[PDB]
Curated annotation (Swiss-Prot):
Organism this protein belongs to: Parengyodontium album (Tritirachium album)
Highest taxon of source: Eukaryota
Cofactor: Ca(2+)
Parent-protein residues present: 106 to 384 of 384
Binding site for Ca(2+) 1: 175, 177, 200
Chain residues that bind Ca(2+) 2: 16, 260
MF term (GO), any: metal ion binding
Record-given protein name: Proteinase K
Lineage of producing organism: Eukaryota, Fungi, Dikarya, Ascomycota, Pezizomycotina
Amino acid sequence: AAQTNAPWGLARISSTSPGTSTYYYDESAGQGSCVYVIDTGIEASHPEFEGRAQMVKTYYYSSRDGNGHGTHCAGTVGSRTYGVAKKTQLFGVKVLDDNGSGQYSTIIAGMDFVASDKNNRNCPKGVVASLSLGGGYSSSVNSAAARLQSSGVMVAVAAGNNNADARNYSPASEPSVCTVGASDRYDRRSSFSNYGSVLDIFGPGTSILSTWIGGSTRSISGTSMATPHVAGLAAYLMTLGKTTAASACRYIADTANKGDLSNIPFGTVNLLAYNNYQA
């Protein structure tokens, strides 16, 4: 399939070169593959989710996304226009209140929830978790992400937006999950993007246009925007049978675009998420 005038991020994951505007992808588009968006929630009623998104769990008075960040990241995973896997079940786990904040215990509970609640969902192609959140290092947050990964879910996490080395941030520093850095449309490491040896892949992270609350759209920047690209890519690749949850991050790193990003610090992988779809 070909989505013309797609967001540059979608066109980039399907491109060996920057500066193109068409997103190419197998029409399966993540059909049968679930992605948990562990964030501020998902405005499931957004027409861009076209019935495929629902809230499955909240730790606050409401499951309404009153922030927009979770709706934005869910839109990058699997919205019809701004999504990587345009046919994927999306599940909202509101571990962040509408200010975008959340106790680590709540975030840990949400990850353990996904590890169990995937057995309550129909994901024959496999399960992905998009964690567009991060704080200082926490071995309990890391181990919770490791549990989620070891349960049979891909865990894609944001490297962080501190322009620092992501070993000091959780769940970014958990080695078993997939730590995603951010790039811009000129194949530059996003100025905010965290780096370091723990990073596994880079996704489009600067000026990412996706869904927003109020049935709208908007463009924002963050590794927390590159993470749904990789999460949606994994769901896309798992539907195609290219890889599994335990192997998706490795597979994405093997099939990525190599050495195409600039301002990648020495020791950080120069890998850009690439669906390697040939129309």
